[PDB]
Design a binder for this molecule. Structure first.
Ligand SMILES: CC(C)(C)OC[C@@H](NS(=O)(=O)Cc1ccccc1)C(=O)NCC(=O)NCc1ccc(C(=N)N)cc1
Ligand SMILES: [Ca+2]
Length: 223
């Protein structure tokens, strides 16, 4: 997260870190057994880490749980990142508490201008690299597709939205991949892609979660 702030320990209790020897992606706890992340975060040997603040120190509120199944969306396109969403089933149920909590899925999509909270342990610099050990947060509005497309020249599919600031300075970044965009208490976005970080006219692009709720529900019912 570039141009954000230190969240405070366990203030984003649905935020998970995916670990394969090191933190490599975020994710969001959606019930005691399931995490939503980005399809581009898929790999074998994922351990889900819940209740994290400092990812390098055991502070006492963590739960580390192996993935039993990973399910990349059937239509994920790794060339364009269309349908950039994956479900991870935990080997055992998380013990839900004030620091390890689920976030609700949307009933309806969010409109342009809606303010959201984006979080993660990704790079905090627009130029060069520094990786924070504690969770960082950013407030950002959803942008209209038309303003986003005209400013950036990006192709925005129906399954993507832009959020952030066209003036630059505030954005998600590498290492925030898979993490939540929460708006009015609903998981509306997943950190997906962009061009650099926090650059003028290059806002962040997010998987449009509301389009996937039927898939998520059916998948959970059958797995
Ligand atoms: C067109 C597509 C195949 C999707 O790839 C575009 C690619 N853009 S990039 O400019 O390579 C992403 C990047 C940004 C900073 C350092 C290194 C890489 C990209 O974003 N690749 C995936 C990726 O790196 N995702 C992480 C990410 C998270 C947030 C942001 C952001 N909001 N600015 C950008 C990339
Ligand atoms: Ca920790």
């Amino acid at each position: 997260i570039v141009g954000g702030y230190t969240c405070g320990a366990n203030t984003v209790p649905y935020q998970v870190s995916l670990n394969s020897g090191y933190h490599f992606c975020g994710g969001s706890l959606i019930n005691s057994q399931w995490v939503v992340s980005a399809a581009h975060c898929y790999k074998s040997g994922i351990q889900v880490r819940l209740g994290e603040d400092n990812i390098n120190v055991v502070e006492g509120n963590e739960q580390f749980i192996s993935a039993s199944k990973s399910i990349v969306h059937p239509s994920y396109n790794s060339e364009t990142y269309n349908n950039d969403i994956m479900l991870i089933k935990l080997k055992s149920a998380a013990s839900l508490n004030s620091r390890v909590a689920s976030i609700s899925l949307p009933t309806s999509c969010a409109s342009a201008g809606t303010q959201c909270l984006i979080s993660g342990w990704g790079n905090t610099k627009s130029s060069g690299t520094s990786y924070p050990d504690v969770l960082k947060c950013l407030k950002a509005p959803i942008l209209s597709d038309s303003s986003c497309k005209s400013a950036s020249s990006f192709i925005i599919t129906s399954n993507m939205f832009c959020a952030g600031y066209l003036e630059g300075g505030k954005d998600a970044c590498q290492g925030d991949s898979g993490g939540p965009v929460v708006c009015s208490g609903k998981l509306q976005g997943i950190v997906s892609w962009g061009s650099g970080c926090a650059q003028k006219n290059k806002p962040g692009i997010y998987t449009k979660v509301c389009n996937y709720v039927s898939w998520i529900k059916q998948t959970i019912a059958s797995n």
